[PDB]
Design a protein around this ligand. Structure first.
Ligand SMILES: [Ca+2]
Ligand SMILES: [Ca+2]
Ligand SMILES: [Ca+2]
Ligand SMILES: [Ca+2]
Lengths: 163, 163
DNA sequence: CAATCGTAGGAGACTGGTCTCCCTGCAGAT
DNA sequence: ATCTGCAGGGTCTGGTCCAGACCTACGATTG
């Protein structure tokens, strides 16, 4: 009963669901780096692999990861960064012994009846709250939608149902 | 000691120099995948990790990797792929215990005096052949530039000089 | 630190200037 | 297969193509 869920973006997170119902969710580690004489955020490769090595999740545990489908109206930098975060997470998860399953956001949103929402990120946090009430405190802020995403991805993988 | 050189893109390659002088170079493993109704080539995560784990270079071996820097005039698909390749390789290298050092193409080309060449890819292959004569049979085709790049990036990190 | 808003953008090496560098993706011809 | 050439491009899930859905990065200003 082990499932991992990853929202790989910069504001994303990794969630881990244990057989006994317990869950953990961690903000994606990032660093500030110099690019074209400005500072940009980038996922912290060594920290992520350090995180994944310290999980009690056994090797072979399925990880569900949201696939990057950036909009054509998004800038080239957005396309590069979402590509880069996707690749860094995929390899980190495979190298750590996990079976990787990409999932489009329409898939898990459709499973939880969240498509076409007027406030998708607040609704994401509400759903994760109801599926994981012990993470309620860790979902209070609007900036926590990444923790919720990761949690809903894992819930999707586990087969959980909203009441 | 040991030096790794990686050209990270789809036509790219990984080179490995031993302290004893013997060199190895392998084409980047890739797979065909469906994207938006067409086939696209994509680096093969599990093969890369499988490859890295089979190397004899010890942990802490420095891995020089070519820094992604797509042209602003390149398409957004190009921006995403180079980002993805770059992220998949970095994480793979870190997970295998290597110390990753990103190098701009201008740095290794200037070292070997290859800047502002009208046939850069031919030139790379000729220099790699001079630097690694037993790799001559592996550099004879024009599509082999990636092998040569990887070899020249590694030759840069080892401090080898052209005659 | 937490939120909202608008747009979609190069980056890199040797007191700023100047010059450099790819890649993807798709079609064709042999 | 190898190469040359040229432009810079969404992608996804699901019910013979296509509808209708989905972000993200990167800076600003507000407190
Ligand atoms: Ca998302
Ligand atoms: Ca997110
Ligand atoms: Ca290159
Ligand atoms: Ca290359």
């Amino acid at each position: 009963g082990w499932v991992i869920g990853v929202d790989p973006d910069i504001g994303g997170a990794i969630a881990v669901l244990s057989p006994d119902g317990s869950s953990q969710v961690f903000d994606n580690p990032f660093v500030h780096i110099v690019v074209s004489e400005v500072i940009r955020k980038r996922l912290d490769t060594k920290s992520i692999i350090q995180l994944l090595r310290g999980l009690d999740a056994p090797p072979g545990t399925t990880a569900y990861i949201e696939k990057s489908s950036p909009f054509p109206t998004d800038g080239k930098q957005g396309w590069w960064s979402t590509g880069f975060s996707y690749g860094l997470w995929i390899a980190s998860l495979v190298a750590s012994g996990f079976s990787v399953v990409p999932i489009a956001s329409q898939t898990w949103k459709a499973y939880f009846g969240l498509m076409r929402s007027e406030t998708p990120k607040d609704d994401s946090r509400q759903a994760a709250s109801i599926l994981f009430p012990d993470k309620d405190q860790s979902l209070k802020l609007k900036k926590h939608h990444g923790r919720a995403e990761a949690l809903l991805l894992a819930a999707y993988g586990k087969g959980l149902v909203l009441p």
